[PDB]
Amino acid sequence: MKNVGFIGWRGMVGSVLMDRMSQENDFENLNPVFFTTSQALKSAFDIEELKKLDIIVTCQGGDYTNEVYPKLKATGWDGYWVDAASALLMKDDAIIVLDPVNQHVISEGLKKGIKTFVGGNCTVSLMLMAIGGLFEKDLVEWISVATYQAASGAGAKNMRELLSQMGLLEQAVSSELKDPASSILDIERKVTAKMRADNFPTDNFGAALGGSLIPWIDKLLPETGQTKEEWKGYAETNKILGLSDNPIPVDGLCVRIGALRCHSQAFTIKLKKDLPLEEIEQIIASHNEWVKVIPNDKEITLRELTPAKVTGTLSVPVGRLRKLAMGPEYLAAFTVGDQLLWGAAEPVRRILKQLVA
């Protein structure tokens, strides 16, 4: 059995990985060696120890990877490096994994000698898990996107801040909400006053999220006006699909909303042909076992196409499918996916499974 080292397994993403691996009994197929950065297991910084392993799975973070990866590689170590961090995503030296979508690029990279794999993540992987069928059939000309991203993508303390913000907003009008005859305008004024107060916890986001939204995720990308988050759509999507040399346009606005773990996305997909909606649905549904086409019905949409339904599951529902007023080649679609699973830990768990098989 392969000797696998794990770094950052106590973090949020790492913890989801540990839980998923346990659930699937992945540990009975490999020899796990756990590391730690604490001085209170082996040290995550002991290069000689890391060199003894066949594979290293890390969810520790970019700073960690940029520090040890180079040192480890320098020792001649020829093992595999699986990273949940985005540090090496665009390295010609590594492949972005999301096997249900790009098994072919993965299998080839392996034959070629690629030893570094970075997990497909956030909105890009969730998008591909939802409409990968359209790309696989080469029907996508371009895609305009509008996201509704959860706090987990930012971090554990961000999720906590969101929850605290929601509590404070309600607590500001707790009594008013109790009497069925109170003024809704009085209630709103108080809630709004609270989210604008200096003592309203907004350190993690830099603005209120709770009963609001933030139309900016990462840092500015000067050359295009995009934010890093938005830039990933074009770069990472094509790298995953292996179309970096002849990229497909994927662009839009990424917005942070008051959700915990699920990223949702609204799509305006420009197809290259005019296909019956029924066929498009079949193409979408057939791509993988997790995508789930939701009928464009109200009751079914409310019960199935929401973070409330999707959170904590591997299901990737896609619905609201119909042609747009712009034309028969313009398709509308809305999808919801859990950020911690297909958006983070699952692609890593899957590539590991392959490497130790």
UniProtKB/Swiss-Prot annotation:
User: What does this protein's UniProt record list under function?
Assistant: Catalyzes the NADPH-dependent formation of L-aspartate-semialdehyde (L-ASA) by the reductive dephosphorylation of L-aspartyl-4-phosphate.
**GO annotation terms (biological process):** 'de novo' L-methionine biosynthetic process; diaminopimelate biosynthetic process; isoleucine biosynthetic process; lysine biosynthetic process via diaminopimelate; threonine biosynthetic process
Q: State how changing residue 256 to K affects the protein, per the record.
A: 2-fold decrease in affinity for ASA and 825-fold decrease in activity
Q: Where does phosphate bind?
A: 89, 232
Q: In which pathway does it act?
A: Amino-acid biosynthesis; L-lysine biosynthesis via DAP pathway; (S)-tetrahydrodipicolinate from L-aspartate: step 2/4; Amino-acid biosynthesis; L-methionine biosynthesis via de novo pathway; L-homoserine from L-aspartate: step 2/3; Amino-acid biosynthesis; L-threonine biosynthesis; L-threonine from L-aspartate: step 2/5
From the UniProt record, list the reaction(s) this protein catalyses: L-aspartate 4-semialdehyde + phosphate + NADP(+) = 4-phospho-L-aspartate + NADPH + H(+)
Q: Key word Oxidoreductase present in the record?
A: yes
Task: Please give the record's comment on domains.
Answer: Consists of two domains, an N-terminal nucleotide-binding domain and a C-terminal dimerization domain.
Task: Supply the name of the protein.
Answer: Aspartate-semialdehyde dehydrogenase
The UniProt family comment states: Belongs to the aspartate-semialdehyde dehydrogenase family.
Catalytic residue list: 122, 263
For the keyword Heme, the answer is: no
For this UniProt record, the keywords arranged alphabetically read as follows: Amino-acid biosynthesis, Diaminopimelate biosynthesis, Lysine biosynthesis, Methionine biosynthesis, NADP, Oxidoreductase, Threonine biosynthesis
What is this enzyme's EC? 1.2.1.11
Gene name in the database record? asd
An example of a GO molecular function for this protein is: NADP binding
Q: Which residues of this UniProt protein bind NADP(+)? A: 10-13, 37-38, 60, 152, 339
Q: Which InterPro entries match?
A: Asp-semialdehyde_DH_CS, Asp_ADH_gamma-type, Asp_semialdehyde_DH, NAD(P)-bd_dom_sf, Semialdehyde_DH_NAD-bd, Semialdhyde_DH_dimer_dom
Output the HAMAP family linked to this UniProt entry. ASADH
Residue positions annotated to bind substrate are 149, 229, 256
Q: How does it assemble?
A: Homodimer.
